[PDB]
């Protein structure tokens, strides 16, 4: 089958950082770039779920969402591991 | 592998008929919240109940799968979508 | 990498020009190494300029850490305050404010600073130890500098020898992955002490009076008085009269102002910094263009920009030097203020085309220094005797005026062999050395223009000017000369992608008669200058600059030009550039408009095709059609009444003091003649009383898209433009920009707005400055409902149904009232949420601070429930603020409770603050309310009585209700009353309105209860993080009294330190200022305890009376600003140790920590990056203030922003929610 | 078979509102968002034709094109039925 | 089905060889008007006659199919494209 | 086989102007539109290489990159032949 | 044909294991320079060496093929990638 499924199964329970390919998003008048952080909680043949999830905003670099999120496999651009996003990273 | 991924997404959406969900898209009007009803091909019919503008409420919409960015579907024993009430 | 520096502060004499003008009390920064050399050179040359004496500039790479060691050698404590950098205020603030430890250094001491740089750009630093505005100040004497940050991995060398350098003004930059380019710096400064060789102040030789103060660039300036004095000796050319040889290098040689050198096609970047204290300047650059904001590629195309004290910008010319077609020659750089230009604030830019090894010489014998070429481009060919290159092939002569260009004038001179070898293979008139039209075969258009002189009538009262001059087309000369047509400025329209040919002729007398305003001027020649287009600078400039030819025309001659327009461009400005100060005030200027391709032009009345005018209709096959209208604003109108008595003459003839008369398109409509029978100012704008004005009026049907072009042909003053009932986008190409309803305009600027008419009625446009309104600069926009016979219908639009409309006629009585409850605003839907409010107005005294300053004639708005509390004296009144959410419907109930006997001036004459042309104007009792950026019917909720609209005002014992709808997230909106501008605006009748996102809730920051008013609340959202909000309102022009009840006179009595001498000031510079009915004048603190550098410390004096804000580290913060002021002088806003996006919606905009050119009606919202405390969350105290050292900071416009470090029982944290 | 073909055949002759995926378009210096309103007139296995059609421009919310337009099936993001084009809808 | 849609679009374009057409694309130079000549794979060749800038006119161009937003093809008995000439 | 391969083999060693489809690119804080010109040097069944290559920058429409570049076939929007980019062309 | 192109791209990248490359993408952080180590499906392995920010260095990254815009791989007898040295 798809080796990526086994890879994400092996990497269960660790904090990772993901970026999608969309230019920007809007949420009731708030605009930001698609960068996410959190712990991987559940993986599926087509998508993965993160909870809790932190969204990096320019003026709110530590805002915490109240609900989990899911991301399709085909929408992932770049990602890495062994990053604790409670630390400071550049956002510009 | 694209066909397999699309099939997985379609099965996941099909198993959720009759539930509440939230959808975020990069295109206008950027957000839909409501009850999923059924799907046609690679398109999903949603009975929208809360969205960006009041004039675009209480009707049906059709969304292509390829423009879905993030989503969440309610499950039993799972955290509830916040009670977004117009006050 | 870690960088280090060593900086010393010294005092020494400064020389500004070769004539010997000097300042004996200069204070500048300098590096440690160069101190001895600079002192020795200063000693050796008592009265000669030295290049080493200049503002300090240093460079560093992005992401580095900088350590600076400072040593002081002055006569007082001093420090260095930075900008746009991350640091801890506990060790590197540069001042003693709040509870922070002192960071300044006494003389002879040392200190260390640490900074981190994260964003590229410009870092401007100055001193705050001494803040006096007199000659004893620090920054006023030239104590400032800047630090420049380059991109990652860059390097810099010398422009001449290529060796390493540490500090300087000219440099070159190399990068591995990016192109190399040259760098330049440009500093503006004014108001410095100046002495001549005799130690006396300069005097104006024509008038024998005092000359204006210093206005120079990089501690240099070139007054014309010295050159005229040299001329009067009879040594240089005797036939040259006053100005035509002012910039000609063939007579005097190169000046001492900065000169920029480079080759063709080299990319360049210019850094612009304003270090002045008082005035606002405009920067203009010939034959070049740049983008509005370098960060985004969707901005507009500009060629000039305004600037304010303590602000900076970046400039990147398109296609490099020489523009698209690669022109060569001399290009001038100057400010556009004509008095300032006469003072000599100008520079020159030089472009070569051949290699310069340093072995060549100028025609006067001066050796030319070498110039290292860039390493990644092909080198220019070496010079040869047959092709010496610029400027050695020009057949000029030293000591005489430059010769005419060849093939320009009919029957002109012939070409020489040098020009033949240097010019292109196929020269044609108007294009000798560079062909601008790309050697293609585009459309060709021809024109014929001449200038005349013929008296003009302004208004019905007979105000007229016998000596007026303007441009006219050749064909219509006979009709206009016979009086059959009405004179007006010249505007013509062409589509894009056109090669333009023009023939120009002069039909002017060579002698200008003298008068009480101006002396006798001999204008025997004139030229033609143009903006925004490509052309040959050598033979099409219209002036005489540097070593170039002279391109002017004597009367009775003819010259031809050629220009190219390659893409869509907005309105462009053209005027004369030789005798501007002589007769530009008389109205010699015009503009042209470039329309989208394949467009058509039709007359708005008959539909016949035309090519010139100010009001036409544009038809296009594909894009929507619209209607176009152009406006011109100008001042310094020399007017005489019907009896010939001069109006507002200056103190002495020839003075540059403003007589003070404005006008629009040779029209005006003063308010003093529109009183009516009842003598009630509330009905000033009603056409039912005195009829429609003579100012331009726009006519259109409902739903017709419109476009407006805005330009200024005035002399020196700034203005603000507002429109009631409409709105438009900021950046047309970029849909992510914000939405505005007001624009600030400087001289020679251009703008364009687009919108549509939502409903029938009448709309008002005016310049909202107090004197501007009082002098009558306003007009109307009219929208019909039926089909008139004298108004054509656009092709793609649908014809409206007919209807019998009886046009109202003036009757001299007020109209009937309206019933707003009968209809709904457009866009609203039935079933929306409803909000309600109650508003009352009254009079009450206001306390300003703890030292007794107060105003006994205050008028404020307030909620109905709060009247009894404020009337008992148990509360201090505050401005009114309202909040609402998107999609809500707002209903407001209004009531008035004014009385007559409480007004101080019943005759309407105000001795202080004064305005020109006072007259009888009794105050009124009725009142209304107006807002902006909201949807409402203009016929029922505009808050004004304009045109034929019904009444919208309430007297005593009456009640009205408005209806407003919110349709978008706009942020902050301004509110004020327009019932009586001369008796209500100044005393504090205004408010603010805020629109927030959906599903938002407001809470009191102390008791956590529901809040409805206030400037410090908490916003909670289900899907968004919690945030704190702060509100600020700025105003000025207030009248105050002391504790003993004596009148106070600002800024005369607020000068620190206490001195008895100070010159005269402008009329509109009087009055006090402050924030939110509060102010903290420093004179009291100075008198109580005279220490200069400890004025801001609250440990000695206490907290100020201005609003105080508190927060915890990491908490998001949003701030909002408004300025419903009255005066004209602009202001700036700045905050310590923070920065924000220029546009909150467009995430690709630039980053800055200031706001510029704030005037009446300005609105903005700010979101801080990283929350409180910056990225690193450093606790401490921070200051917010203005940027004008002169007359602003000393008057008490500043506050304290406090970030706590330990939890306080009275300030709950955001964690609990 | 393609279900959308039958669906659009069933919904022939009625108004419709269609939004594409592109961020912004440009026509001779005029920029706008890709929003369309009009009637369906012709259906093809790969595209459809609209006539008359209206383009929602911010400064001209009722500008109508002089020629019919065609859109491919793969470039459609959202759409809805039974909405009159003459009604005024929020734009900003 | 995606290949079916691509084949349908290709056949529709092929049937219109020799006619006039208009194409709008989101990328520079944003607009083409001309006559179809011949087709290569998933790429179509157009002899443009008028575009945004005159300096890029009177030459050949190639367009990838997947980046076309809207288009129109002239047919006998149908409304004609307006005569867009530069005067 | 693939006609594009044969066509690009036929057009070996000539000038060409190429534009991709991405909205904009960023390099160390420098933003520009994706326009390239230069010679063609090598062809693969999936990509082609240009050497030397020129990038149309607003401040420098004649900047020469110091290394060759490769473009995938599927990332092509518009192109044309027999045009020398040393000529001056409007860009905005 | 599309799968053929993808296979060709994957083979070209696979033959370049152990070589220094440069990749430019429209999405943040917009640039990567380093060495190829592994290959997983349609995702590449790069040990980064130099990028936009120095704080994001000396670690491992994953890149999807579809988002690659331009690229280059060095080979013996070819110009070397310039070294962005922090002086």
For chain F, the domain total comes to: 1
Q: Which helix (H) or strand (E) holds F88?
A: none
- Measured from the Cβ of residue E36, the count of other Cβ atoms closer than 10 Å reads 19
Say which experimental method was used. cryo-EM
Extract the tokens encoding C871.
């009337």
Interstrand relation of E60-64 and C203-204 (parallel, antiparallel or unpaired): unpaired
Extract the tokens encoding B33.
């919240």
Residue numbers in G near C63 (CB within 8 A): 53-54
Extract the tokens encoding E64.
């990838």
Residue F26's domain comprises 3-81
Most F CBs within 10 A among E6, E24, E28, hence the mutation to make, goes to: E28
Q: What SS3 state is found at D45?
A: coil
Q: Which helix (H) or strand (E) holds E7?
A: helix E2-15
d(CA C782, CA C761): 7
Residues from C contacting G (CB-CB < 8 Å) are: 1, 63, 152-153, 155, 176-177
Contact between residue C28 and residue C142 where contact means Cβ atoms under 8 Å apart: yes
Alpha-carbon distances of C796 from C740, C944, D33, D59, rounded to whole Å: 29, 34, 21, 15
Extract the tokens encoding C40.
């020795």
Residues with Cβ within 8 Å of residue A1, at least 6 apart in sequence: none
d(CA C565, CA C436): 9
Are C567 and F64 in contact (CB < 8 Å)? no
Contact between residue C259 and residue C348 where contact means Cβ atoms under 8 Å apart: yes
Instruction: Using the structure block, give the residue that is written with the tokens 């998003």.
Output: A25
Q: Is E77 on the interface with D (CB under 8 A)?
A: no
Of C297, C215, C303, C1153, nearest in space to C746 by CA: C303
Residue B58, sorted as left (phi over 0), alpha (psi -120 to 50) or beta, turns out to be left
- Measured from the Cβ of residue D66, the count of other Cβ atoms closer than 10 Å reads 12
Most D CBs within 10 A among E50, E70, E75, E84, hence the mutation to make, goes to: E70
Which ranges of C739-787 does DSSP label H, i.e. alpha helix? 770-775
Name all contacts of C1096-1103 with Cβ < 8 Å and 24+ positions apart. C1096/C95, C1096/C96, C1096/C97, C1096/C98, C1096/C1183, C1096/C1198, C1097/C96, C1097/C97, C1097/C98, C1098/C97, C1098/C98, C1098/C99, C1098/C1200, C1099/C99, C1103/C1200
Query: What's A42's domain CATH number?
Result: 2.30.30.100
D39 is a domain residue: yes
Residues with Cβ within 8 Å of residue D56, at least 6 apart in sequence: D32, D33, D35, D36, D37, D89, D91
C833 is a domain residue: yes
Q: What SS3 state is found at G5?
A: helix
Interstrand relation of C750-756 and C705-712 (parallel, antiparallel or unpaired): antiparallel
Residue C727's domain comprises 669-813
- Measured from the Cβ of residue C159, the count of other Cβ atoms closer than 10 Å reads 19
d(CA D7, CA C143): 76
Alpha-carbon distances of C123 from C3, C310, C1172, rounded to whole Å: 16, 11, 21
Contact between residue C593 and residue C496 where contact means Cβ atoms under 8 Å apart: no
Of C128, C28, C137, nearest in space to C79 by CA: C128
d(CA C1041, CA B12): 76
Are F59 and C151 in contact (CB < 8 Å)? no
Where a domain ends, among C773, C796, C813?
A: C813
Domain boundaries, chain G: 2-73
Residue numbers in F near C324 (CB within 8 A): 88, 90
Instruction: Tell me the backbone φ, ψ of residue C978, rounded to 5 degrees.
Output: -120, 30
Measured in whole angstroms, the distance separating CA C972 from the mean position of its chain's CA atoms is 22
Longest dimension (CA), chain G: 48
Verify that C907 and C1041 share a domain, yes or no.
no
d(CA C777, CA C714): 13
Q: Which helix (H) or strand (E) holds D8?
A: helix D3-10
For chain C, the domain total comes to: 5
Of C433, C381, C382, nearest in space to C405 by CA: C433
Residues with Cβ within 8 Å of residue C265, at least 6 apart in sequence: C320, C321, C322, C326, C377, F62
d(CA C132, CA C705): 53
Question: In whole angstroms, how large is the CA radius of gyration of chain B?
Answer: 13
Q: What is the dihedral of CA C766, C772, C777, C781, to 10 degrees?
A: 10
Of D29, D26, E25, nearest in space to C596 by CA: D29
d(CA C551, CA C532): 19
Q: Is G24 on the interface with A (CB under 8 A)?
A: no
Answer whether CATH 2.30.30.100 is correct for domain B2-73.
yes
Verify that C492 and C578 share a domain, yes or no.
yes
d(CA C1113, CA C741): 36
Query: What's C529's domain CATH number?
Result: 2.60.40.420
Alpha-carbon distances of C400 from C236, C249, C368, C524, C957, rounded to whole Å: 8, 10, 22, 18, 80
Report which DSSP code applies to B82.
Answer: P
- DSSP secondary structure letters along E25-80: -SSTT-EEEEEEEEEETTEEEEEEEEES-GGG-SSEEEEEGGG--EEEE--TTSPP
C403 is a domain residue: no
Q: How close are the terminal C-alpha atoms of chain D, in Å?
A: 40
Verify that C830 and C776 share a domain, yes or no.
no
What subunits touch chain F, counting only 3 or more CB pairs under 8 A?
Answer: C, E, G
Question: In whole angstroms, how large is the CA radius of gyration of chain A?
Answer: 13
Q: What SS3 state is found at C567?
A: coil
Resolution (A): 3.4
Q: Which residue of chain B has the CA closest to D23?
A: B27
Residues with Cβ within 8 Å of residue C679, at least 6 apart in sequence: C922
A92 is a domain residue: no
Instruction: Using the structure block, give the residue that is written with the tokens 């059709």.
Output: B62
Q: Which helix (H) or strand (E) holds C916?
A: none
Which ranges of C443-535 does DSSP label H, i.e. alpha helix? 477-481
Give CA angle at E16 (E10, E20), nearest 5°. 125
Of D58, F88, F66, nearest in space to C566 by CA: F88
Residue numbers in E near F78 (CB within 8 A): 25, 27-29, 61-64
Residue numbers in F near E64 (CB within 8 A): 76-78
Are E84 and C598 in contact (CB < 8 Å)? yes
d(CA A83, CA A86): 9
- Measured from the Cβ of residue B50, the count of other Cβ atoms closer than 10 Å reads 18
Contact between residue C1163 and residue C1047 where contact means Cβ atoms under 8 Å apart: no
d(CA C881, CA C615): 41
d(CA D13, CA D19): 19
Where chain A is discontinuous (C–N > 2.5 Å), the residues before each break are none
Where a domain ends, among C813, C839, C855?
A: C813
- DSSP secondary structure letters along C1099-1116: TTS---SS--EEE-TT--
Contact between residue E71 and residue D20 where contact means Cβ atoms under 8 Å apart: no
Instruction: Tell me the backbone φ, ψ of residue C538, rounded to 5 degrees.
Output: -70, -40
Give CA angle at C1123 (C1117, C1126), nearest 5°. 165
- Measured from the Cβ of residue C276, the count of other Cβ atoms closer than 10 Å reads 25
> How far B31 CA lies from chain D's nearest CA (Å)?
11
Which residue in A24, A70, A75 is closest to B72 by CB distance? A70
Verify that C1066 and C1176 share a domain, yes or no.
yes
Which residue in C829, C1001, C1023 is closest to B54 by CB distance? C829
Q: Up-side HSE of residue C876: CA atoms within 13 Å toward CB?
A: 13
Verify that C589 and C519 share a domain, yes or no.
yes
Are A68 and B79 in contact (CB < 8 Å)? yes
Are G86 and C155 in contact (CB < 8 Å)? no
- Measured from the Cβ of residue C885, the count of other Cβ atoms closer than 10 Å reads 19
Residue numbers in C near A60 (CB within 8 A): 1025, 1116, 1171
């Amino acid at each position: 089958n798809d080796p990526l499924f086994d890879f994400f199964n092996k990497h269960m329970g660790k904090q990772i950082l993901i970026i999608t390919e969309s230019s920007q998003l809007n949420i009731l008048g708030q605009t930001f770039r698609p960068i996410f952080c959190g712990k991987v909680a559940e993986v599926e043949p087509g998508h993965l779920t993160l909870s809790p999830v932190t969204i990096k905003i320019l003026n709110a670099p530590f805002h915490k969402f109240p609900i989990p999120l899911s991301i399709p496999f085909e929408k992932i651009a770049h990602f890495t591991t062994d990053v604790d996003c409670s630390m400071r990273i550049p956002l510009v | 592998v694209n066909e397999i991924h699309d099939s997985a997404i379609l099965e996941h959406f099909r198993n959720g008929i009759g539930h509440k969900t939230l959808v975020i898209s990069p295109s206008y009007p950027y957000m839909f919240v409501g009850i999923i009803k059924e799907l046609i091909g690679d398109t999903v019919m949603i009975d929208v109940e809360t969205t960006h503008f009041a004039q675009l409420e209480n009707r049906e919409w059709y969304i292509h799968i390829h423009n879905i960015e993030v989503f969440y579907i309610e499950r039993p024993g799972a955290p509830k979508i916040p009670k977004l009430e117009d006050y | 990498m870690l960088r280090k520096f060593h900086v010393v502060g010294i005092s020494t004499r400064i020389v500004v020009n070769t004539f010997g003008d000097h300042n004996p009390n200069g204070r500048i920064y300098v590096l440690k190494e160069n101190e001895s050399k600079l002192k020795d050179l200063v000693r050796k040359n008592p009265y000669k300029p030295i290049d080493l004496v200049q503002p300090l500039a240093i460079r560093a790479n992005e992401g580095d850490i900088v350590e600076i060691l400072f040593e002081n050698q002055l006569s007082f404590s001093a420090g260095m305050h930075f900008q746009e950098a991350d640091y801890s205020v506990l060790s590197s603030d540069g001042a003693d404010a709040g509870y922070n430890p002192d960071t300044t250094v006494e003389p002879g001491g040392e200190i260390l600073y640490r900074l981190n740089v994260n964003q590229e750009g410009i870092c401007f630093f100055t001193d705050l130890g001494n803040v006096s505005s007199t000659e004893q100040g620090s920054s006023v004497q030239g104590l400032f500098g800047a630090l420049l940050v380059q991109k990652r991995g860059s390097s810099w060398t010398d422009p001449v020898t290529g060796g390493p350098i540490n500090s300087g003004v000219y440099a070159d930059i190399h990068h591995p992955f990016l192109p190399s380019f040259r760098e330049y710096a440009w500093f503006f400064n004014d108001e410095m002490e100046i002495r001549d060789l005799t130690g006396e102040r300069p005097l104006n030789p024509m008038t024998n009076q005092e000359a204006e103060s210093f206005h120079g660039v990089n501690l240099r300036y070139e007054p014309m008085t010295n050159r005229k004095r040299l001329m009067e000796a009879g040594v240089v050319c005797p036939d040259c009269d006053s100005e035509e040889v002012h910039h000609d290098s063939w007579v005097f040689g190169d000046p001492a102002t900065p000169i920029l050198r480079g080759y063709v096609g080299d990319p360049a970047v210019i850094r612009l910094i304003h270090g002045g204290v008082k005035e606002t300047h405009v920067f203009h650059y010939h034959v070049h263009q740049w983008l509005g904001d370098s960060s985004n590629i969707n901005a507009e195309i500009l060629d000039a920009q305004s600037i304010s004290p303590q602000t900076h910008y970046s400039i990147q010319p398109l296609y490099g030097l020489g523009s698209l077609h690669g022109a060569i020659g001399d290009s001038i750089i100057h400010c556009h203020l004509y008095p300032a230009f006469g003072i000599g604030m100008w520079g020159m830019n030089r472009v070569f085309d051949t290699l310069q090894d340093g072995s060549q010489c100028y025609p006067n014998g001066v050796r030319i220094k070498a110039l290292m070429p860039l390493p990644d481009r092909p080198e220019p060919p070496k010079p040869t005797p047959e092709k010496p290159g610029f400027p050695n092939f020009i057949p000029g002569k030293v000591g005489y005026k430059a010769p005419r260009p060849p093939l320009g004038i009919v029957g002109g001179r012939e070409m020489t062999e040098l020009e033949r070898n240097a010019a292109i293979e196929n020269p044609r008139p108007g294009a000798v050395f560079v062909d601008p039209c790309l050697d293609q075969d585009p459309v060709v258009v021809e024109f014929n223009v001449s200038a005349i002189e013929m008296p003009v009538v302004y208004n019905k009262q007979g105000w007229h000017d016998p000596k007026a001059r303007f441009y006219v087309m050749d064909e219509d000369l006979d009709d206009i000369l016979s009086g059959k047509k009405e004179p007006e400025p010249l505007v013509f329209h062409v589509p894009a992608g056109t090669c333009i040919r023009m023939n120009y002729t002069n039909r002017m007398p060579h002698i200008l008669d003298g008068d009480a305003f101006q002396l006798v001027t001999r204008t025997y020649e004139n030229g033609f200058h143009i903006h925004f287009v490509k052309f040959d600078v050598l033979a099409c400039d219209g002036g005489n600059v540097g070593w170039n030819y002279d391109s002017a025309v004597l009367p009775g001659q003819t010259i031809r030009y050629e220009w190219y327009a390659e893409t869509e461009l907005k309105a462009f400005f053209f005027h004369d550039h030789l005798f501007a100060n002589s007769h530009q005030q008389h109205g010699v200027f015009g503009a042209g408009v470039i329309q989208p391709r394949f467009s058509k032009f039709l007359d708005s009345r008959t539909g016949d095709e035309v090519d010139h005018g100010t009001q036409i209709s544009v038809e296009h096959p594909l894009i929507p059609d619209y209607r176009d209208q152009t406006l011109f604003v100008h001042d310094f109108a020399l007017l005489f009444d019907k009896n010939g008595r001069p109006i507002q003459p200056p103190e002495y003839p020839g003075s540059e003091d403003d007589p003070g008369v404005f006008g629009v398109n040779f029209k005006c409509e003063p308010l003093k003649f529109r009183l009516g029978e009842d003598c009630d100012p509330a009905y000033s704008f009603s056409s039912y009383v005195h009829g429609d004005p003579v100012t331009p009026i726009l006519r259109a049907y409902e739903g017709d898209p419109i476009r407006i072009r805005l330009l200024q042909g005035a002399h020196e003053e700034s203005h603000s433009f507002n429109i009631h009932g409409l709105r438009w986008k900021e950046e047309r190409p970029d849909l992510g920009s914000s939405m505005k309803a007001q624009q600030h305009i400087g001289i020679s600027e251009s703008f364009t707005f687009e919108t549509e008419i939502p409903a029938s009625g009448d709309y008002l446009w005016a310049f909202e400055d107090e004197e501007d309104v009082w002098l009558g600069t306003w007009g109307l926009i009219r929208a019909y409902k039926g089909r008139m016979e004298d108004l054509i219908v656009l092709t793609d639009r649908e014809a409206l149904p007919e209807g019998s409309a009886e046009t109202p006629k003036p009757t001299g009585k007020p109209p009937e009232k309206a019933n707003p409850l009968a209809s709904l605003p457009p866009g609203a839907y039935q079933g929306s949420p409803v909000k309600k409010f109650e508003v009352v107005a009254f009079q009450t005294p206001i306390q300003y601070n703890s030292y007794g300053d107060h105003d006994p004639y205050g008028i404020i708005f307030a909620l109905k429930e709060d009247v009894e509390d404020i009337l008992t004296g148990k509360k201090n009144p505050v401005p009114l603020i309202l909040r609402a959410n998107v999609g809500d419907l707002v209903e407001v109930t209004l009531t008035s409770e004014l009385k007559k006997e409480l007004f101080p001036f019943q005759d309407g004459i105000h001795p202080y603050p004064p305005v020109k042309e006072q007259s009888f104007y009794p105050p009124s009792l009725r009142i209304s309310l107006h807002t902006s950026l909201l949807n409402y019917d203009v016929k029922t909720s505009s808050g004004d009585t304009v045109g034929y609209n019904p009444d919208q005002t309430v007297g005593p014992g009456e009640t009205i209700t408005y209806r407003w709808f919110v349709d978008g997230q706009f942020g902050m909106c301004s509110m004020w009353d327009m019932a009586d501008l001369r008796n209500h605006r100044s005393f504090g009748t205004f408010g603010a309105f805020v629109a927030e996102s959906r599903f938002t809730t407001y809470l009191d920051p102390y008791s956590l209860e529901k809040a409805i008013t206030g400037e410090n609340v908490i916003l909670r959202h289900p899907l968004l993080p919690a945030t704190r909000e702060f509100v600020l309102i700025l105003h000025d022009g207030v009248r105050l009294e002391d504790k003993d009840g004596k009148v106070i006179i600002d800024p005369m009595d607020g000068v620190v330190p206490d001195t008895e001498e100070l010159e005269e000031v402008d009329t509109y510079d009087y009055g006090s200022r402050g924030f939110n009915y509060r102010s903290e004048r420093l004179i009291n603190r100075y008198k109580e305890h005279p220490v200069m550098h400890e004025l801001f410390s609250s440990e000695v004096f206490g907290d100020p009376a201005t609003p105080l804000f508190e927060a915890y580290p990491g908490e998001p913060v949003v701030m909002r600003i408004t300025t419903p002021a009255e005066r004209r002088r602009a202001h700036t806003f700045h905050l310590h140790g923070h920065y924000w996006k220029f546009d909150s919606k467009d995430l690709d905009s630039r980053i800055q920590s200031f706001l510029g050119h704030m005037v009446t009606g300005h609105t903005d919202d700010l979101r801080l990056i990283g929350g409180a405390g910056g990225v690193f969350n450093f606790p401490g105290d921070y200051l917010y203030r203005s940027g004008n050292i002169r007359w602003d900071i000393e008057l008490g416009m500043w506050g304290i922003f406090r970030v706590h470090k330990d939890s306080k029982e009275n300030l709950p944290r955001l964690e609990e929610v």
